[PDB]
Structures are given as C-alpha cells and as structure tokens.
Amino acid sequence: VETFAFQAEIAQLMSLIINTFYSNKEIFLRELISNSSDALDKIRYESLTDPSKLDSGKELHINLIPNKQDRTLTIVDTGIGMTKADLINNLGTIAKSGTKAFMEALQAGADISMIGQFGVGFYSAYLVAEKVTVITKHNDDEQYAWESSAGGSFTVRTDTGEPMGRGTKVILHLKEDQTEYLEERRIKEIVKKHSQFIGYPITLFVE
Numbered sequence: 585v586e587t588f589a590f591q592a593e594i595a596q597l598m599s600l601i602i603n604t605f606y607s608n609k610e611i612f613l614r615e616l617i618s619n620s621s622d623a624l625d626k627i628r629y630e631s632l633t634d635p636s637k638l639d640s641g642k643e644l645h646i647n648l649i650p651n652k653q654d655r656t657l658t659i660v661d662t663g664i665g666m667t668k669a670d671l672i673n674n675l676g677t678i679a680k681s682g683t684k685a686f687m688e689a690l691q692a693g694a695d696i697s698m699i700g701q702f703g704v705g706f707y708s709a710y711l712v713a714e715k716v717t718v719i720t721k722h723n724d725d726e727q728y729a730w731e732s733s734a735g736g737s738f739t740v741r742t743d744t745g746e747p748m749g750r751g752t753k754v755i756l757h758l759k760e761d762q763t764e765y766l767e768e769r770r771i772k773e774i775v776k777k778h779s780q781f782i783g784y785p786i787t788l789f790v791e
C-alpha cells in the first residue's frame with residue numbers, strides 16, 4: 585500500500601467540492617460516464633489499427649451498479665484503463681492547470697456543474713461520496729486500486745481482487761444523505777437527462 589499526498593491545488597479542488605453549498609449534485613454521474621465514454625473511445629481508436637488491443641475484452645460498454653446494502657454506486661467501463669503512472673498523475677488528467685482554470689471560472693460567475701469543461705470532472709464524485717475507490721486495468725500494466733476519502737491523501741495498491749480484463753471501475757461509497765443515487769428511477773432520470781448521446785450501452789443493473 586503506497587500513500588501519496590495530492591498536489592495542493594488538487595486538495596483545494598476537493599475541499600471546494602466537499603464544502604461549497606451546491607444542490608445540483610446529480611452532475612457527478614454525467615461526469616463519470618463522460619470519462620468512461622472518453623476511455624472507450626481511446627481503446628476503440630487503438631483497435632482500428634491493432635485488433636489485438638481488444639484481446640482483453642471485445643465488448644465496449646458502461647455498467648451502472650447500485651448496491652443499497654454496501655451503500656455504493658459502482659460505474660464499470662471496458663475502456664483503455666489506466667496505468668499506475670496514470671492513477672498517480674491525477675487519474676489521467678492535467679488537474680493542476682484544470683483546477684486553476686476552474687477556480688477562475690467560479691470567481692467570475694461559473695458554477696460546479698461546469699467542472700467537466702476544465703477536464704477535472706472525476707473530482708465531482710466527492711459531491712456524493714465520502715470515499716472513492718478506482719480499480720483500473722490497462723493493457724500495458726497490472727490491475728491497481730486507487731483510493732481516497734480526500735483529506736489530502738490517496739493510496740495505490742496492486743489489486744488482488746476480481747480481475748477486470750481491461751477498463752475502469754469507480755466505486756462510490758456514498759454519503760448517508762445521498763442514497764437517492766442508488767434508487768433505479770433516480771439514476772434512470774439522470775442518465776436520460778445528461779447522458780443521452782453516449783455512444784456505448786449503459787446498463788443499469790437492478791438489485
């Protein structure tokens with residue numbers, strides 16, 4: 585288990601997301617599905633010239649998995665996945681420069697729903713989650729588990745859990761008052777509203 589400190593600007597983005605009074609929290613799902621879509625686009629582009637890039641899984645899809653007993657919402661995709669270097673380097677984002685632009689936008693009038701325009705939409709997960717576990721598998725690396733309850737640190741470990749072939753799994757350990765995002769009709773509503781032009785099947789698992 586390795587423990588790393590976020591870069592100051594990233595810990596400042598995370599505490600802004602957690603602390604600001606802002607009711608439109610549902611946008612986290614749009615932000616996580618949009619990332620899944622971008623990673624699936626990346627593996628699909630690679631497969632156009634190299635069919636073997638799909639040996640670790642031919643099906644390109646997004647699964648939404650609520651679990652009321654564990655109080656988790658899991659978003660699974662069969663995208664390009666991330667390397668350890670990608671996980672440590674802010675989950676494949678240019679987060680330092682993205683946070684800086686997002687902060688200027690907010691001061692000038694923008695709102696938290698615009699986070700994805702600054703390439704840092706992943707961190708919108710902390711609107712509804714107290715802890716986020718990122719499980720990922722890239723063709724060029726091993727399966728890793730990134731985890732953080734914010735508070736300025738995150739951990740990285742080799743995942744000894746269930747292998748995923750390729751892709752990314754975001755486990756959201758929801759806040760106590762945010763369990764509406766485990767209800768079928770609520771997730772369905774959010775998908776129809778914000779993710780209607782995703783070019784991959786979005787399957788909402790039932791319990």
Ligand SMILES: CCc1cc(-c2[nH]nc(C)c2-c2ccccc2F)c(O)cc1O
Nearest residue numbers: 619620622623663665666675676706752
């Ligand atoms: C943890 C954030 C997250 C990352 C990925 C991901 N997997 N593989 C890559 C390239 C990416 C990626 C996508 C957008 C921006 C940056 C990224 F690194 C994903 O599929 C879903 C996600 O919820």
